[PDB]
């Protein structure tokens, strides 16, 4: 589509069985059976998975200012709101939309979103705890972006993280 693009660094879109997207995380569907989560049978021991969007319009990449996101977990048997969230903006190279947008690490490692450098952590404040149910509203200084995302950790009695929606907004006016 033109508009905003959502991305992960891995997504259980592989296995046919499996309906998980990243792209039901831009889709303003709040609905539990349409959700992006990492979920593995095995694992990766390192908790970490990253989603975020990057801010298209009429199928170009634009920067945004932005001061303000929504996040929407889910949780079941495998799955949940993470146990650490850190917002980052992107600070690397010019790129395009990952061919492999929902699975960056593994099937397109050269992507510079794959570079841990090109992140830069933004400081927030959630209005509730971060857990699976209510939509969590986040707030943090307005910072100049063409891409954001969520750098999060999974349970340690999980095995995977899971989200119905994530959104960026413009700052308050
Ligand atoms: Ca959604």
């Given at each position: 589509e033109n508009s905003n693009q959502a991305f992960a660094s891995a997504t259980n879109?592989?296995?046919?069985?499996?309906?998980?997207?990243?792209?039901y995380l831009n889709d303003g569907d709040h609905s539990e059976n349409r959700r992006w989560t990492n979920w593995s049978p095995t694992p990766s021991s390192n908790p970490?998975?990253?989603?975020?969007?990057?801010?298209?319009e009429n199928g170009k990449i634009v920067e945004r200012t932005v001061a303000q996101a929504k996040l929407h977990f889910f949780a079941d048997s495998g799955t949940d709101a993470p146990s650490k969230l850190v917002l980052e903006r992107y600070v690397g190279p010019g790129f395009e939309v990952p061919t492999y947008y929902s699975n960056y690490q593994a099937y397109e490692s050269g992507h510079p979103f794959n570079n841990p450098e090109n992140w830069e952590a933004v400081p927030y404040?959630?209005?509730?705890?971060?857990?699976?149910?209510?939509?969590?509203?986040?707030?943090?200084?307005?910072?100049?972006?063409?891409?954001?995302?969520?750098?999060?950790?999974?349970?340690?009695?999980?095995?995977?993280?899971?989200?119905?929606?994530?959104?960026?907004?413009?700052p308050s006016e």
């Amino acid at each position: 589509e033109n508009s905003n693009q959502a991305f992960a660094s891995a997504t259980n879109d592989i296995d046919k069985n499996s309906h998980d997207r990243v792209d039901y995380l831009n889709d303003g569907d709040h609905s539990e059976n349409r959700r992006w989560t990492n979920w593995s049978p095995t694992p990766s021991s390192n908790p970490e998975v990253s989603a975020g969007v990057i801010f298209r319009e009429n199928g170009k990449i634009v920067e945004r200012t932005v001061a303000q996101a929504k996040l929407h977990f889910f949780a079941d048997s495998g799955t949940d709101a993470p146990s650490k969230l850190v917002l980052e903006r992107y600070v690397g190279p010019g790129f395009e939309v990952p061919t492999y947008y929902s699975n960056y690490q593994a099937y397109e490692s050269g992507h510079p979103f794959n570079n841990p450098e090109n992140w830069e952590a933004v400081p927030y404040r959630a209005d509730k705890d971060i857990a699976a149910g209510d939509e969590i509203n986040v707030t943090f200084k307005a910072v100049k972006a063409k891409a954001m995302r969520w750098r999060m950790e999974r349970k340690a009695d999980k095995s995977g993280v899971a989200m119905i929606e994530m959104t960026f907004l413009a700052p308050s006016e």
